[PDB]
């Protein structure tokens, strides 16, 4: 859907580079990603550079498929996570599932927290196993947030990062959302700041 | 995956694809236009040698043979073709 | 099926999945038949008239449906992209 | 070997029908074959079809409908007589009405409810339905 | 000179192809030098869809080489000194039936004397400066018949436009349906 | 899958469609017609001049560049050998194996292998039976090859 400025803009060199997620791992490159700039000889894969704006933010029309955004969720069960996904919870759509997922909550009518979906999301596709297969059933679309690591067989499109440690998992969702939201919703269109951190966004208590 | 156009699918699939398997089979191997630096000849090699061929004549040595592709040495512009 | 003049003579006629024109056998249950939607111009979904389809059992079990509707509302008049019949 | 050619593409179209592949790719491409599939053709089972050469023996797309039920090649080829088709059709043809025995004769690689319109018969190689 | 260049007899279009012939190598040194022996059959004029003709020549054979080594200047003179018109190069080859049974032997056929083979030729001398890269071939529910024709993506401006007429002039000779694709 | 183990392979060449010319190259075919006939003297094989042709100059296969298949060519020339070249490698590994097996007729693998090789070879001297091209009888004898070759 070529447009304007959704496009790099003054700040998106300066704010990641704090944060990492042009980075990607130590020994592992996993056949199953276009989604690693080369690969340096001296210790480690300089995630390719320009392709996350490809298939993180498919991932944003897809959906634009909601008329309801809380079916629009978090998928998660980390530390660092429960304040992201809870979180993508709160400021828009959805039953949170981070801690528990839920098993069932996709398989068979007889639990708990009750899914029927048509596209949930998904961190860690090593944590979050069960987009790929509560979807490889019947009918449920699936969007993994795909490191240089994640089996990509039915979980049909591109969303990588990095999780070694830090913030960025929670504190990357937040795009997903921010740019579905500038299709359909209530916020305003090249800038006028945005009112939160990424420095509320980070732990709650260690 | 119910159905595809196997005809033409991706340039991607290909590159990959195991070469007696593009349906119309094509090779990988292709030729490479050497000027030794004191010569400027220009000599038609081989990506997969199997000899090393001497340049024209000065002789020189040009391309050692390995399991597939020559090792090329150091003088050589290689221009492919 | 029919007589020596013109006189329909069966139960019915099966209903056949719609991407895969096989057959659905009375007591399938796995058994879809959708009903999406369209919308009128205007964040209205429109009434009392819908899009229709049809799944198997079939397919439900082999991953398959999602990819096959998501080939057929863009393959029909409605969706935008996702899908290749190039790939 | 690949001791036979018809019999082995035959097979995978059906292996493809079964699973609901809407098609098929198959190697070794014949005349015998092409002409095979002008009679499926004729007959309503299957559509479009797009020979592929290369200079060899050979490469042919199939596009589905998903009516195939059922396309066996027989296979000494047996002789066949005119009277005799009249034992074949019913022992392997659901029906009668339907759905053709097939065979190979001299105008014609060309089944049997033709053939008494020809009244000719040889040989006897595939059948559908 | 030119009746010479015309390797018949007769004689009305020919003697003012022969004139367009002995007047390149009257006029272009440096073209004489090559043109001078290179001797032909007959002409053909075949209609196209939009109007426009298309000019068919006719090679005696062997030359098939000396026309190649100058056709891709040649043509050129002529398109200008010929209007609509599309100059083309095939050769004369003598096809044969098939023995039939009470028939005879005679000697062989000499496979490339088939029917397919010269349609092959006919192709490699319907375009020229291309080469041929992928045939292939459709068949649909009215056995249709239609050669895609697989083209390289270099040299299609030797000319591309001619195509709308190629299909034709491969359908008068054979009584056939093509079509073409640039792949990308 | 080859005709005497457990062992499937596949890897030959993926000749490339274009019939003729390879354009990028413009000599002639005259040209390797010479370097062939060059060639063979010296002391030839068919199956290498191709190799050699290939590493060396314009070519790319005799075969585009000419209206033949080396051989053909050689055979015209009378360069055919009396022999269809590839069997006398094989005859070879004959006399080189027979020798082996006597210095140590305690050895099993080499026998078996031997015989196995006596049979790729006479079935391939079956065929150059058949067509013309072994005087017929010829029949293959163990010990007749130390002074057929040196």
């Known amino acids: 859907s070529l447009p304007a400025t959704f496009d790099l803009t003054p700040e998106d060199a300066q704010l990641l580079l704090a944060a990492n997620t042009h980075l990607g791992a130590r020994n592992v490159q996993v056949h199953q990603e276009p989604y690693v700039f080369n690969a340096r000889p001296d210790g480690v894969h300089v995630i390719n550079v320009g392709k996350t704006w490809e298939k993180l933010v498919l991932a944003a029309r897809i959906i634009a498929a909601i008329p309801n955004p809380e079916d629009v969720v978090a998928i998660s069960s980390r530390t660092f996570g429960q304040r992201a996904v809870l979180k993508f919870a709160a400021h828009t759509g959805a039953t949170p599932i981070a801690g528990r997922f839920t098993p069932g909550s996709f398989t068979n009518y007889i639990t708990r927290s009750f899914k029927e979906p048509r596209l949930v999301i998904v961190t860690d596709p090593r944590s979050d196993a069960q987009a790929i297969k509560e979807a490889s059933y019947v009918n449920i679309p699936v969007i993994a947030l795909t490191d240089l690591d994640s089996p990509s067989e039915f979980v049909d499109v591109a969303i990588p990062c990095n999780n070694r440690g830090k913030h960025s998992i929670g504190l990357i969702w937040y795009l997903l959302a921010r740019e579905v939201l500038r299709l359909r919703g209530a916020l305003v269109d090249r800038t006028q700041p945005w009112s939160i951190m990424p420095d509320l966004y980070f732990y709650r208590d260690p | 995956v119910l159905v595809q156009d196997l005809l033409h699918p991706t340039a991607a699939s290909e590159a990959r694809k195991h070469k007696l398997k593009t349906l119309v089979q094509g090779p990988r191997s292709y030729f490479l236009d050497v000027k030794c630096p004191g010569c400027l000849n220009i000599t038609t090699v081989f990506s997969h040698a199997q000899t090393a061929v001497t340049c024209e004549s000065c002789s020189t040595i040009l391309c050692t043979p390995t399991g597939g592709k020559a090792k090329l040495s150091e003088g050589t512009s290689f221009r492919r073709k | 099926m029919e007589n020596d003049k013109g006189q329909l003579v069966e139960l019915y006629v099966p209903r056949k999945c719609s991407a895969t024109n096989r057959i659905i056998k009375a007591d399938d249950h796995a058994s879809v038949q959708i009903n999406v939607a369209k919308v009128d111009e205007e964040g209205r979904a429109i009434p009392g008239e819908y899009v229709t389809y049809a799944l198997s059992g079939y397919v439900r079990s082999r991953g398959e449906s999602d990819d096959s509707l998501n080939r057929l509302a863009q393959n029909d008049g409605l969706l935008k992209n996702v899908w290749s019949y190039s790939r | 070997t690949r001791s036979s050619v018809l019999a082995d593409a035959l097979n995978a179209i059906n292996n493809a029908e079964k699973t609901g592949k809407r098609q098929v790719l198959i190697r070794p491409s014949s005349k015998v074959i092409i002409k095979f599939l002008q009679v499926m053709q004729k007959h309503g089972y299957i559509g479009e079809f797009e020979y592929i050469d290369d200079h060899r023996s050979g490469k042919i797309v199939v596009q589905l409908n998903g009516r195939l039920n059922k396309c066996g090649v027989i296979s000494p080829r047996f002789n066949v007589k005119i009277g005799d088709i009249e034992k074949w059709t019913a022992n392997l043809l659901p029906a009668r009405q339907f759905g053709y025995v097939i065979l190979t004769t001299s105008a014609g690689i060309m089944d049997h409810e033709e053939a008494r319109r020809k009244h000719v018969s040889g040989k006897i190689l595939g059948f559908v339905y | ?184 | 899958g080859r005709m005497h183990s457990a062992g499937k392979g596949i890897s030959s060449s993926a000749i490339p469609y274009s019939r003729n010319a390879p354009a990028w190259f413009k000599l002639s075919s005259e040209s390797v017609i010479e370097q062939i006939v060059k060639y063979a003297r010296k002391g030839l094989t068919p199956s290498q001049i191709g190799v050699l042709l290939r590493d060396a100059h314009g070519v790319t296969q005799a075969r585009v560049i000419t209206g033949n298949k080396i051989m053909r060519i050689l055979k015209s020339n009378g360069l055919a050998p009396e022999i269809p070249e590839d069997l006398y490698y094989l005859i070879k590994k004959a006399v080189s194996v027979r020798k082996h097996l006597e210095r140590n007729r305690k050895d099993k693998d080499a026998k078996f292998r031997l015989i196995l090789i006596e049979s790729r070879i006479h079935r391939l001297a079956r065929y150059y039976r058949t067509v013309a091209v072994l005087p017929p009888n010829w029949k293959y004898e163990s010990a007749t090859a130390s002074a057929l070759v040196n």
């Open chain 5, 1 to 184: 000179p030119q009746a010479k260049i015309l390797s018949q007899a007769p004689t009305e279009l020919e003697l003012q192809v022969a004139q367009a012939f002995v007047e390149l190598e009257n006029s272009s040194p440096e073209l004489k030098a090559e043109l001078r022996p290179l001797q032909f059959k007959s002409i053909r004029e075949i209609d196209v869809a939009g109007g426009k003709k298309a000019l068919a020549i006719f090679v005696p054979v062997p030359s098939l080489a000396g026309f190649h080594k100058v056709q891709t200047k040649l043509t050129r003179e002529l398109e200008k000194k010929f209007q609509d018109r599309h100059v083309i190069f095939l050769a004369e080859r003598r096809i044969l039936p098939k023995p039939s049974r009470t028939s005879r032997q005679v000697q062989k056929r000499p496979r490339s004397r088939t029917l397919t083979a010269v349609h092959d030729k006919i192709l490699e001398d319907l375009v020229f400066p291309t080469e041929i890269v992928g045939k292939r071939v459709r068949y649909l529910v009215g056995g249709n018949k239609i050669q895609k024709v697989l083209l390289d993506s270099k040299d299609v401006q030797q000319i591309d436009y001619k195509l709308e007429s190629f299909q034709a002039v491969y359908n008068k000779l054979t009584g056939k349906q093509i079509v073409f694709e640039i792949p990308s």
